[PDB]
Design a protein around this ligand. Structure first.
Ligand SMILES: Nc1ncnc2c1ncn2[C@@H]1O[C@H](CSCC[C@H](N)C(=O)O)[C@@H](O)[C@H]1O
Ligand SMILES: [Ca+2]
Ligand SMILES: [Ca+2]
Ligand SMILES: [Ca+2]
Ligand SMILES: [Ca+2]
Ligand SMILES: [Ca+2]
Length: 288
C-alpha cells in the first residue's frame, strides 16, 4: 500500500542518515526516541552506547520491552522517560550515571519541531544538545520541511481561514492564516501550529513549524554550524546508489516503484519525499 511504501522509504532514509553520521565506537543520544525502533540501525553503524529519552513513559516502556527481547547486543542501551526540550537534560539523566556524556552524536527523528512550540523551548533544546555533545560532534535528524510548507502556503489565498492541503493519505491544516495576513511570512518562528494527519501513522496531531532559517540561526548562537539540509527526495536520490546492494533484499524490494527503479511514487510521493527534510549540524565550539 502507499503507507507501507512510505514507512519503508522513511526507514531507508533513517538507515542512510544514521550511517552517514555514526561511526564505530560512538555514543549516541537520541532525543524524543519514541518506541526506540532504530536501535539496529545504530548497531549496524557500530555504536558503543545508545541513550534514548522520550517524554512519554508509555513509549519508553514499549522501547524497554522491545530492547529486552533482543539478544547478544554489542552495545549498551539506556532508555529514559524525560523532557528533552522544555527542561535541562540533567533532570532526566541524573539517575542514569552510566550514560557516557559528552556523547559523539545527538539524533532526533520526526520530533524536533515539538521544541518550536515556544522560543524558550527551542533554546532549551539547543542548549541541551550542545552541552551533551563533544566539540566536533554531530546533531542530525529528520523534520518537516518549512521550505515546502512555505511553497504550499504561498499558493493559498488570504481568504482561507485555515490553510490546508493534502491528498488521500495525508493532510495539513493550519490553525490560522496569520502567515498569509503577514505578507506570506510567519509572524514568529515559534508556535505556528498545524494539525497533521498521516494515514495509520499520525492521528490529526498538532505540530509546529520549524522554520529552517531560524533553526540554523539559533543553532549558530550555540556553536553549531550547518552540515546538511537536503530534502528526503534529493537525499535518497544521491545516496541510494551506495546503498542498493546493502539493504535487506526485502527492504530493497520495498523501495521499488512501478517503473522498477528505487524510490516512491503515487499518493505517497508528496508526504514521503517532499514534506520532510534531513538536517545536520556540527558542534564547532563550546557554548560559553
Ligand atoms: N518535550 C519533549 N521531550 C521529549 N520527547 C518529546 C517531547 N515532546 C514530544 N516528544 C516526543 O516526540 C515524539 C514525536 S513522534 C517521533 C518518535 C520517534 N522519534 C519516531 O521516529 O518514531 C514522541 O515520541 C513524543 O513523545
Ligand atoms: Ca530557554
Ligand atoms: Ca516565514
Ligand atoms: Ca556550514
Ligand atoms: Ca545540504
Ligand atoms: Ca533537497
Amino acid at each position: 500500500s502507499p503507507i507501507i511504501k512510505l514507512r519503508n522509504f522513511n526507514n531507508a532514509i533513517k538507515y542512510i542518515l544514521i550511517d552517514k553520521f555514526t561511526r564505530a565506537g560512538d555514543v549516541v543520544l537520541e532525543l524524543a526516541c519514541g518506541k526506540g525502533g532504530d536501535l539496529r540501525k545504530y548497531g549496524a553503524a557500530g555504536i558503543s552506547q545508545f541513550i534514548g529519552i522520550d517524554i512519554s513513559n508509555a513509549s519508553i516502556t514499549e522501547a524497554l520491552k522491545r530492547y529486552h527481547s533482543m539478544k547478544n547486543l554489542e552495545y549498551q542501551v539506556i532508555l529514559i522517560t524525560g523532557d528533552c526540550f522544555g527542561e535541562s537534560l540533567g533532570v532526566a539523566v541524573e539517575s542514569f550515571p552510566e550514560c557516557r556524556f559528552p556523547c559523539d552524536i545527538v539524533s532526533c527523528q520526526f520530533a524536533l519541531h515539538y521544541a518550536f512550540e515556544t522560543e524558550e523551548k527551542a533554546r532549551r533544546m539547543l542548549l541541551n544538545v550542545v552541552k551533551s555533545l563533544k566539540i566536533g560532534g554531530y546533531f542530525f535528524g529528520t523534520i518537516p520541511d518549512s521550505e515546502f510548507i512555505r511553497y504550499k502556503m504561498n499558493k493559498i489565498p488570504e481568504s482561507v481561514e485555515k490553510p490546508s492541503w493534502g491528498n488521500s493519505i495525508y493532510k495539513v491544516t493550519f490553525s490560522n492564516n496569520e502567515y498569509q495576513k503577514n505578507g506570506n511570512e510567519f509572524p514568529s518562528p515559534f508556535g505556528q501550529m498545524y494539525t497533521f494527519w498521516l494515514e495509520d501513522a499520525i492521528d490529526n496531531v498538532p505540530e509546529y513549524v520549524i522554520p529552517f532559517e531560524s533553526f540554523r540561526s539559533l543553532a549558530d548562537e550555540y556553536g553549531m554550524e550547518l552540515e546538511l539540509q537536503k530534502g528526503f527526495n534529493e537525499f535518497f536520490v544521491e545516496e541510494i546508489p551506495n546503498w542498493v546492494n546493502r539493504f535487506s533484499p526485502k527492504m530493497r524490494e520495498g523501495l521499488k516503484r512501478s517503473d522498477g527503479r528505487y524510490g516512491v511514487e503515487g499518493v505517497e510521493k508528496e508526504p514521503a519525499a517532499y514534506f520532510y527534510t534531513t538536517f545536520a549540524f556540527r558542534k564547532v565550539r563550546d557554548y560559553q
